């Protein structure tokens, strides 16, 4: 699991 961001 990635998560990239705001």
Sequence with gaps: AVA???
């Design 4 to 6: 990239a961001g705001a």
